Amino acid sequence: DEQEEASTKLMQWLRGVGDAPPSASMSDENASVSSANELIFYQVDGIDYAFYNTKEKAMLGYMRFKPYQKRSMKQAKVHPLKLLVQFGEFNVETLAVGEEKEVHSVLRVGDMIEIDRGTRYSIQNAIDKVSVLMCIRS
Amino acid sequence: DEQEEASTKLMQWLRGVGDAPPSASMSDENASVSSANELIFYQVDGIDYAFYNTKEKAMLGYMRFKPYQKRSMKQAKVHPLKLLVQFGEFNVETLAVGEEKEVHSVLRVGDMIEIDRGTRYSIQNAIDKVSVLMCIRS
């Protein structure tokens, strides 16, 4: 249940509900390791982002959405990405290169969507609670 | 609490404790979407793997470890990877190209380690419960 407690503490922090998870080991000093305690949320144009400190920056992180919050349209101009739902529910609208018709998808926890290079995409929190997604860039 | 229930059901399935999460939307039919219900665990050399069905296969998935289970040494020969702890605790041993001294790291939930191209690495479940990690390939 210790590990259930650790998991719950991490999720509550990601959702903005709880305090930062405790430290545990000196492994957070290792070059290749980015611990959860490294994460710090910063707000950009209304959305809270927190990224691990990887060798190539901004390649793995979380987006935290206020209830029903909208992220404006962006384009995967350089890096294809994957969006993986960590908590809650999201509506994602995509328009791939060459197509002229948008696609709307609904994503619940554990669902993933792949955004190809060139695809324009918008994200909206579908529920009246904070939702969290993981952003994985290629 | 509906979304707390969905999150708990997904984690219990990943840990091998519960049944598959329910369906929800027709978005699982969308080309770019890989729903959690797509996941199916298969055992290879003692370890349970489940991968999303992405355009380039085997690029995002989970490894489920029995108590104290060891994954033998592998090498990131082609793809650098990131390992992100989803539940439990792992000891990871790495030997990067050019170095002659191994590095041992301990990872708890939400911690990530980056395995560079050429690095040899071994993984052991550090606890007497099932632990789960996410494997992210570049």
Author numbering:
A (entry chain A), B (entry chain A): 1274 to 1411
Give the article text.
Centromeres are microtubule attachment sites on chromosomes defined by the enrichment of histone variant CENP‐A‐containing nucleosomes. To preserve centromere identity, CENP‐A must be escorted to centromeres by a CENP‐A‐specific chaperone for deposition. Instead, fly‐specific CAL1 appears to combine the roles of both HJURP and the Mis18 complex: pre‐nucleosomal CENP‐A recognition and its targeting to the centromere for deposition, respectively (Phansalkar et al, 2012). In this study, we present the structural basis for the recognition of CENP‐A/H4 and CENP‐C by CAL1.
Crystallisation trials carried out with CENP‐C1264–1411 alone and in complex with CAL1 produced diffraction quality crystals which diffracted X‐rays to about 1.8 and 2.3 Å, respectively. The twofold axis of the CENP‐C1264–1411 dimer was aligned with the crystallographic twofold axis. As expected, CENP‐C1264–1411 domain forms a cupin fold almost entirely made of β strands forming a β‐barrel with a helix preceding the cupin domain. In this arrangement, the loop connecting the N‐terminal α helix (α1) to β1 crosses over to its dimeric counterpart resulting in a “roof”‐like positioning of α‐helices on top of the β barrels. Structural comparison of dm and budding yeast CENP‐C cupin domains showed that although these domains share only weak similarity at the amino acid sequence level (21%), the overall fold conferring the β barrel structure is conserved.
